[PDB]
Amino acid sequence: AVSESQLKKMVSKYKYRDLTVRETVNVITLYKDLKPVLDSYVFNDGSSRELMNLTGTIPVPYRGNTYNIPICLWLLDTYPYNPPICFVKPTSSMTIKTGKHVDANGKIYLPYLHEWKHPQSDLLGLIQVMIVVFGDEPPVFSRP
């Protein structure tokens, strides 16, 4: 994690870059499988803007195993509380399973942000909740 240094630099805009970098590192520090990615898209009336996001294959445990499921979510600035954009990014050799959590595009359903908002939960807890769901049921179980 040498980019981490350049990361805080790739942002240095967020309300709490430090607090953010600390929240991100914490995540990868808990998983070590995830990786913070950088993205540059337009927003301000169509004006390029730096936006962060987490990506990587989380170690999804099973009844007696632990696979790796890809996930990607956009990290907002600091509102309203957490990033509502949290969807799975499966490959092409996989098989997305439609349900109450997933539709087909691999977009996590439910309000979540408009559910817990204890908040109590944290960036980690967020990816933790999904891991709990992605651990119980197959979010995109692949084939042999």
Binding site: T57, V60, N65, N68, P90, V140, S142
Partner: peptide, 9 residues
């Protein structure tokens, strides 16, 4: 590590 995802049954 590659994703793939855990299979069913």
């Amino acid at each position: 590590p590659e994703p793939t995802a855990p299979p069913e049954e």
